[PDB]
Amino acid sequence: TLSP
Amino acid sequence: HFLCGVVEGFYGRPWVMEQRKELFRRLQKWELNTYLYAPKDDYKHRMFWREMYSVEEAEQLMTLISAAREYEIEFIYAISPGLDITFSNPKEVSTLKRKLDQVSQFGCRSFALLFDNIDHNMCAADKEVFSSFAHAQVSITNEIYQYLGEPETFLFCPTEYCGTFCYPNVSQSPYLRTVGEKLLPGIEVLWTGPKVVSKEIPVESIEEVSKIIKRAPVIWDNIHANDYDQKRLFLGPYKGRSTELIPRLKGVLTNPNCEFEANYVAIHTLATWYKSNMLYSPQMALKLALTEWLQEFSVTLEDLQLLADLFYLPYEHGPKGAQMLREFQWLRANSSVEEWRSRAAKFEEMCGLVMGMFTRLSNCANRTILYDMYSYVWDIKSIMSMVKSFVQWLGCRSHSSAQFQEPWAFRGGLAGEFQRLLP
Amino acid sequence: HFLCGVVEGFYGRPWVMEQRKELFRRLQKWELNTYLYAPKDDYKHRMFWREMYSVEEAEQLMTLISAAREYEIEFIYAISPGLDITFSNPKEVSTLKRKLDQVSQFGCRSFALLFDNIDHNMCAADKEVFSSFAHAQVSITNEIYQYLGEPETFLFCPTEYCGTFCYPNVSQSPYLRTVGEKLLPGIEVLWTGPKVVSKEIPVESIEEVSKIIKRAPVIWDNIHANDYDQKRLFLGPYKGRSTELIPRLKGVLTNPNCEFEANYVAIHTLATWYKYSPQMALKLALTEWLQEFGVPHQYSVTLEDLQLLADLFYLPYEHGPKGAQMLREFQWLRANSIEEWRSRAAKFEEMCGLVMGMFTRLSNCANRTILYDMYSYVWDIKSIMSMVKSFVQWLGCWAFRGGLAGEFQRLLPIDGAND
Ligand SMILES: *[C@@H]1O[C@H](CO)[C@@H](O)[C@H](O)[C@H]1NC(C)=O
Ligand SMILES: *[C@@H]1O[C@H](CO)[C@@H](O)[C@H](O)[C@H]1NC(C)=O
């Protein structure tokens, strides 16, 4: 999935 | 009033209006009722969430929301101020409302805030106005909920949005314990199952989450999402979800393959599963979806049978593909050179069928379908060619010593090289 | 005059018209002149090449060819019938003519017939009428040439179209000897070099090919072609082709990445070459590209990033400096698991950090077209470096990866013969  | 359909919520190239119209037609063709707009990489959905739509962008969004009503599919508009916003700043809140105001005048009634995938603590300013992280999100969600006059349907996706993402565990969480208690009951909660991509959602796991959430949650379902693996595509049936679940959920929204046309089996088999309990068999739903898909395309049902088996499900290959695997596994192990030759030939044929499925697929009528899937099928065809070739080499070796160069022999570039050095 | 430009000649989704016409802008801006239409999977170019365009497709094509002339780019329409054509049957050779004529009236003056990637055996009917496979393609090629008034540019791509594809070598090829002598004077031959993807195109080799075909060939160049591996993209400079080849050839047409926007270096550096240091040409190309990556305008990506991007997706036989480096650094660390290691682990995590950095900035650029074309590539590299960043720390203090293909792929010993 993701973060910055 | 039970929500079932698609969420466009992946990373990557989003769909275009012409795909989303073709999406709606299919949704009511098969009796689903909802669409959630949350494509992570439309700059205005998340990345630049304070920003108003341009004039050409307004025109587009209105034409879309129009077509949504023209097909009586409910259109939900999401936004994601997760990684950026100052919760305690009221100009920040204003811009958020200004943005949602803009979209309501496009024709839009249903709304959603997403707080998936962001850092677990706030700025120096925020540490004061709110006691905890979970406290800050609800404040604005509710402030917003009411502003819109508390609309028809309004979803909330939490930071802890699935079992593994709950700290320390799922029912012992201050985060989710706050949400259940301090979030308005007119607001829905999105949940993805025990994991982000869930092999299965047990009836038990929803009861457990429902009690800390103090509602029946709407599933954001990642069963067919392919955005996290370049080589991967998913054309298998909706599977690992009990029909027993419909009574306990406010809906399921499927987050599917980035490639739009690939999502035929994904959405159809979901359609039948919901038609079932508003039990159900995956092996047959697929049989229904595949024969009907075959209409749209030369290629046989047998070809699509093979095709979905090679690109089945995130924890499961399909019957014809699992077999092709164990077969090549046995063949490479037992390297005598009795029956071994018998099985090489049988495998080599099974390879030629992939080459077959690829050919008739390329010679097909429906060019949109070919393209969304081209690189996925070219890849499988080429590996099966090397694999046929390699078994060929292994047989023609009791009579040769010739040991096993164009670039497509060694593969995957730099990524592939790093990957091969991992245990 | 010498032909230099792009050929849209790859498998998969073909570029759209609004992309092609942007290509025409870029060709002109950079003083290039040619564009060969040969996209293998655009219906009515290859698969069913018999079917004339609709009332709608005529509108689109005529509009495009018009645009090619507006920017002083020679449009070459190409046709791949070799899949299932019967040579002798003139219902066919008429159909060839018939289709050609149709596009001629879209305002089109240059053509090519393509015979790459087809079987060496014809049907029984043609086995009678024609002597050899070579003799056969020639026959139809010339007739069509004359049928259109012996046009100014006319190209023929052979079946033995690179060093490796000739029986048994290039200088004594029956197929090539025939084309050489019996294919007409005014028609040009397409050639990819030693290999289908030539790492280098040596001068000695072009001499060798020219002798046995009695022309200087036009290079169909696959240096930057990526259609053939899902994970591969090539943003490295044009390389391996000496400027001394130029006098010895009639053209270079580059068959570049499937994703349109990704072909900026591929094309810029080819122009640069056409006028040479590949390291210097990348710098010129990167620096100019940087201006196409802005941040969006608001009412409420550094050069060093592009350099890293290029180095991670560089050329088919070569990783770029920063790619090569990180690979060596991680190789040494996996090996050595006094404390100098920690200090070079520390430097490696920062390197990885720049991969995530580059992905993040790329994610905010206003030019969404560019971002999308390259997305799944930049994503993959970022995901893997995060994990490599991580696993290096497993030393300090995804089992279905690739799906079925990836699983089969790990069982062939032949991979990992490039590490
Ligand atoms: C997290 O991961 C999924 C699968 O990659 C991605 O599509 C999704 O948008 C992200 N957020 C949620 C709630 O799934
Ligand atoms: C052969 O291979 C290249 C790269 O895979 C492909 O793009 C090209 O269309 C084919 N034909 C020729 C003449 O190269």
Author numbering:
A (entry chain D): 381 to 384
B (entry chain C): 59 to 336, 373 to 391, 552 to 591, 605 to 671, 676 to 694
C (entry chain A): 59 to 333, 374 to 398, 553 to 589, 604 to 663, 679 to 700
List sentences quoted exactly from the publication behind this structure:
OGA is the unique enzyme responsible for O-GlcNAc hydrolysis from a large number of cytoplasmic and nuclear proteins. Recently, our group and others have independently identified crystallizable constructs of OGA that comprise the catalytic domain and stalk domain, and published the apo form structures and enzyme complexes with active site inhibitors. These reports consistently showed that OGA formed an unusual arm-in-arm homodimer, where the catalytic domain of one monomer covered by the stalk domain of the sister monomer to create a potential substrate-binding cleft. Exploiting our previously reported construct of OGAcryst (residues 60–704 with the unstructured insert residues 401–552 replaced by a glycine–serine (GS) linker), we solved the structures of a mutant OGAcryst-D175N (catalytically impaired but retaining the ability to bind substrate) in apo form and in complex with each of four synthetic glycopeptides.
In the substrate complexes, all the glycopeptides were bound in the OGA substrate-binding cleft. Particularly, the GlcNAc moieties were anchored by the same set of OGA residues in the catalytic pocket, displaying nearly identical binding conformations regardless of the glycosylated residues or the flanking peptide sequences. Consistent with the O-GlcNAc hydrolysis mechanism, the catalytic residue D174 was optimally positioned to make a hydrogen bond with the N-acetyl group of GlcNAc in all the complexed structures. The N175 mutant side chain played an important role in anchoring the glycosylated hydroxyl of serine or threonine and stabilizing the OGA substrate complexes. Compared to the glycosylated serine, the extra methyl group of the glycosylated threonine (as found in ELK1 and Lamin B1 peptides in Fig. 2c, d) was well accommodated in the hydrophobic pocket harboring F223 and V254 residues from the top surface of the catalytic domain and W679 from the stalk domain of the sister monomer. In the structure of OGA-ELK1 complex, residues Y69 and N175 anchored the peptide backbone. Furthermore, side chain specific interactions with cleft surface residues reinforced the binding. We find that OGA is able to bind peptide substrates in different directions, but in a conserved conformation regardless of the glycosylation site or flanking sequences.
